[PDB]
Amino acid sequence: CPLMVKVLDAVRGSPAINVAVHVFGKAADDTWEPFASGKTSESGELHGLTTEEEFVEGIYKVEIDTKSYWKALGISPFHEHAEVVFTANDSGPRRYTIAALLSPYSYSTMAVVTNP
Amino acid sequence: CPLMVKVLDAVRGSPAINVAVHVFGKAADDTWEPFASGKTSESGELHGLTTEEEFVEGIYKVEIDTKSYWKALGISPFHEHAEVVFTANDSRRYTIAALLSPYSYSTMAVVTNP
Amino acid sequence: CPLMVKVLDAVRGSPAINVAVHVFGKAADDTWEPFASGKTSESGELHGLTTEEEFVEGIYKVEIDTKSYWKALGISPFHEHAEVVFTANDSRRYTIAALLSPYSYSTMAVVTNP
Amino acid sequence: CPLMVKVLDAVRGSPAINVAVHVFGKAADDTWEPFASGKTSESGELHGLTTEEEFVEGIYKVEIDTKSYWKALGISPFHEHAEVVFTANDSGPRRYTIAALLSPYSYSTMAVVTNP
C-alpha cells in the first residue's frame, strides 16, 4: 500500500465513513487525468488505491469529497472538497498516508511519508 | 497589548463569541494562580488581558472554556477546555488563536515584533 | 471587501509574508480561469482581491503557493500548493485562513455578516 | 486498549517518536493525580497505558511533552506541552484515541471515541 487515505470527523469524534476519494495524476500535457478512486471504510481508511509499480513519479491530486459527506449528515459545509496536491516518488518509491480531519468550515490535512 | 486571544468556531464558520478565557501564572510553590480573564467579543477576540509591565517572563497557561460554549449551542463536546501553556520570553506581542470543533481543536501562536 | 486571505507559518510562529495567492472562477466549459491574485503582506493578509459587484455566486478556488514559500526558507515541503474550493452564496464577507507547516496545513473559513 | 495516544510531526511528515506522555486523573479533592505514563513508539503510538477495569469514569488530563521533543530536534517551540482534558467513561466504557499533530508554534488534537 504505497498510498492510503484516512479521514476523520471532528464533529462526531469518529472515522468519516463512505467518503468518496478521487486521485488524479498530472499527464504529459499538464492536464489532470484520473488515476484511482474509492471510498473510506468503517475505519475511515481507504486502502488498495494503487500498487508500487503503477504509482510512478509525478504530481498527484487526492480530492476528498467532503461536501457530500456533510450534506448526508444534515450539514451544509463550506468546502466543495478537500484537495491534497503533491509530488510523489521523485526520490524513489515511498509510502504515503494522507490524513484529513474534517469540520464543516475547516479541515486539516497531514501526510506521513515513509521509506520501506 | 502584549497578549491577545482569538477563538473561532469551525462548525459554524464564525467567531466564537462570549467564550470565557482564564489566564494563570505559574507561581513559587509551582501552582497556577489567576492572572487575567475575560470573555471573547463578537469578533471572537479578547484584548486587554494584561500590560507590558505586568507580563514578565515566566510560564503562563491560557484556559479556554470550550465545553460551556458547545453546551450552549446544544452540541456534545469532547474536551473540558482547551489549554495553551507557554513561556513568555523577552527578546514582543503574543496572539494565541484556537480553532474549535466538538472533538478537535487546533491552536496557533503568532509572536510578532515592535 | 468580500474576500480576504490570511496565511500563517506554524514553524516560525509568524505571518506568512509574500506568499502568492491565486483565485480562479469556475467557468462555462467548467474550466478554472484566473479571477484575482496577489501576495500576502507583512501581516500575512491579502486584501483587495475582488469587489462586491464582481464576486457573484459561483464556485471559486483559492490556490496558495506554499511550496515556493517553504523553498525560500530552505525547508522541504510536502504539498505543491494549498487549495480552498467553495461556493459563494448570497444570503457576506469571507475570510479564508491557512495555517502552514511543511507536511500539513489547516484551513478555516470565517463567513460574517454586514 | 481503552486509551491510546498517537503523535505526528508536521515538520518532518513522520510519527513523533519517543514523545513522553503523562496521564492524570482528577481525585476526590479535585487535585490532579498521576494515572499512567509512557512514550510513543517508532509508529508515534502509545498503547498499554491502562485497562478497562482501571480506567474508571472521571476527568482525565493527557499531557504530551512536546517541548522536549522539539528541543532534541534543534527547535525551540512555543508550547511547554500539549494538554488534552476530557471526561471519560461517564456513559459506560469507551475506547479513546487521542491524536496530536505537532508543529513548533501550533498543534491540533483530535479524539476518536468508540463503543466496543
Author numbering:
A (entry chain A), D (entry chain A): 10 to 125
B (entry chain B), C (entry chain B): 10 to 100, 103 to 125
What's the publication's text?
We took profit of the fact that R34G/T119M- and K35T/T119M-TTR double mutants do not aggregate significantly at acidic pH to solve their crystal structures at pH 5.5 at 1.5 and 1.4 Å resolutions, respectively. As expected, no major structural differences between the pathogenic mutants and T119M-TTR were observed, with overall Root Mean Square Deviation (RMSD) values for the Cα of 0.24 Å for R34G/T119M-TTR and 0.15 Å for K35T/T119M-TTR. Indeed, putty-style cartoon representations based on mean Cα β-factors show much greater values in these regions, pointing them as the most dynamic in K35T/T119M and R34G/T119M TTR. It is worth mentioning that the higher flexibility of the BC loop in both chains of R34G matches with its higher instability revealed by the thermodynamic analysis. The contact region at the tetrameric interface of double mutants, which consists of hydrophobic interactions between the AB- (residues 18–28) and the GH loop (residues 105–122), was preserved. The presence of Met119 keeps all those interaction residues virtually at the same positions, which allow the formation of key contacts in the presence of the second amyloidogenic mutation. Although the crystallographic structures of the double mutant variants were very similar to that of T119M-TTR at the same pH, greater flexibility of the BC-loop (higher Cα β-factors) was observed in the presence of the K35T and, especially, the R34G mutations.
TTR is an extracellular soluble nonglycosylated tetrameric protein synthesized mainly in the liver, retinal pigment epithelium, pancreas, and choroid plexus. TTR transports holoretinol-binding protein and is a minor carrier of thyroxine (T4) in the blood, whereas in the cerebrospinal fluid, it is the primary carrier of T4 (5). Extracellular misfolding and misassembly of TTR lead to the formation and accumulation of amyloid fibrils in a variety of tissues, which gives rise to distinct progressive clinical syndromes known as TTR-related amyloidosis. It is well established that TTR tetramer dissociation is the rate-limiting step for amyloid fibril formation.
